[PDB]
Amino acid sequence: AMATGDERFYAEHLMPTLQGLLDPESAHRLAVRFTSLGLLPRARFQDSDMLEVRVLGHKFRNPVGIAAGFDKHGEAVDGLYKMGFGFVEIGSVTPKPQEGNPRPRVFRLPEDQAVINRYGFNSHGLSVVEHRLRARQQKQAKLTEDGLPLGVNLGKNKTSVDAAEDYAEGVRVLGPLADYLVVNVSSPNTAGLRSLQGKAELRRLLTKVLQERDGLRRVHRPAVLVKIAPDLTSQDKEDIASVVKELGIDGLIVTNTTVSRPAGLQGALRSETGGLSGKPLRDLSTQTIREMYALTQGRVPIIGVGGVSSGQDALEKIRAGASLVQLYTALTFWGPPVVGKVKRELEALLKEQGFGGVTDAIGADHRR
């Protein structure tokens, strides 16, 4: 098709050529610019009824979202919907602006279809992102009503003494502009951050976040999700499940990047510090989804993320317990046509496997 035409040209020729000419962070920045300007191939794929998902108090036209980290500062939201994503997540956003780690801080592993990053929460800060989202607040309200919700992922400043107050500030400032908020406690690139996944610290943190969210006016009151690492102990996962059910957290995002280095990585840059994304993360993420779904008795919506670059990858996460999926790293290798590719392949597999739609497949592996 013209679809598989663009998919082949981007994957085989355009993206490898452009990535060969540019430093990885330069490629990221240009991508945000092109997306914000709508300089994108046609998204030929027409979302069908069988891809619609109702979760987190919203309609999602399709279950494929852009993961946090691509649009950290909310500059490219409308262009990301134009790419065919069913939902957009921006961030992480920190309270105050901060530069993040020194460059280079992004590394390509094309032999592994992976990336390693150590951006360190480079952020324009809440004030700048607030004003950027306010400029399109009513445009977003219409997109959300039309099944295209917006998520905002909150982080904490490097030098902050009170992590919970940083997240609370994010809820107050960006909560009113979001369909869902993400308490990102799983960056591998902020010292001490992943310790906030521990039981006593998570319960205190999430209580404060939920109190702040509950204090927002009804039309401005987002869902709250916790985004977790793929590197948790069994004890950590049990504790997170316990706290999420105790406090009525609305959902989980499973998973962030890994600080592991699976056996078999080939890229020259495999021993760089940072979080590993893409294909080597895929099954570690899927198995984290599977465990979190079971520990929460299928009662807590999961957004599955890590190494999705095909319909099969998306359906494996859905059958493991994800209601929605996200991708980022595949877009660095395949370019924008990957979104229609994943959607087309997912629709075909749902039909092949006897599912009426995405909803019927959620958690299907647990019922075998």
Ligand X SMILES: Cc1cc2nc3c(=O)[nH]c(=O)nc-3n(C[C@H](O)[C@H](O)[C@H](O)COP(=O)(O)O)c2cc1C
Ligand Y SMILES: O=C(O)c1cc(=O)[nH]c(=O)[nH]1
Ligand Z SMILES: CCn1c(CO)nn(-c2cc3c([C@@H](C)C(F)(F)F)nn(-c4ccccc4C)c(=O)c3cc2F)c1=O
- The DSSP letter of residue 61 is S
Interface pick for ligand Y out of 113, 140, 256, 326 (rule CB under 6 A):
256
By CB under 6 A, residue 118 contacts ligand Y: yes
Q: Is 3 in the site for ligand Z (CB under 6 A)?
A: no
State the binding string over 6-35 for ligand Z (x if CB under 6 A, else -).
------------xx--x-x--xx-xx--xx
Phi-psi region of 307 (alpha: psi -120 to 50; beta: other; left: phi over 0): left
- The stretch near ligand Y (CB under 6 A) out of 27-35, 119-127, 160-168, 314-322 is 119-127
Give whichever of 116 and 168 is closer to ligand Z, judged by the CB atom.
116
**Residue from the set 335, 337, 340, 363 that interacts with ligand Z by CB under 6 A:** 335
Cα(195)–Cα(228) distance, integer angstroms: 11
3-state class of 343 per DSSP? helix
Q: Is 91 in the site for ligand X (CB under 6 A)?
A: yes
In whole angstroms, the minimum distance from the beta carbon of 53 to Cl ion comes to: 9
Task: Name the pairing type of β-strands 64-66 and 58-60.
Answer: unpaired
CA distance 253 to 225: 7
Identify whether the C-beta of residue 150 lies closer than 8 Å to the C-beta of residue 88: yes
Phi, psi of 357 (to 5 degrees): -170, -175
Q: How far apart are CA 62 and CA 48, in angstroms?
A: 8
70 is in an annotated binding site: yes
Establish whether the linkage from the previous residue to 286 is cis, with ω within 30° of 0: no
Say whether 257 counts as a known binding-site residue. Answer: yes
Bridge partners (DSSP) listed for residue 117: 106, 275
Contacting residue, 107, 119, 180, 355, with Cl ion by CB under 5 A: 107
113 scored as a contact of ligand X (CB under 6 A): no
Give the residue numbers annotated as catalytic, written as ranges.
Answer: 187
| 281 lies in the binding site for ligand Z (CB under 6 A) | no
Residue 305 contacts which entry, ligand Y, ligand X, Cl ion, none (Cβ below 5-8 A, type-dependent) = ligand X
The least CB distance from residue 29 to ligand Z, in Å, is 8
The Cα–Cα gap between 212 and 202 comes to 15
Quick one: 62 or 277, whose CB is closer to ligand Y? 277
Tell me which residues touch Cl ion (CB under 5 A).
Answer: 24, 57, 81-82, 107-108, 176, 233-234, 259-261, 273
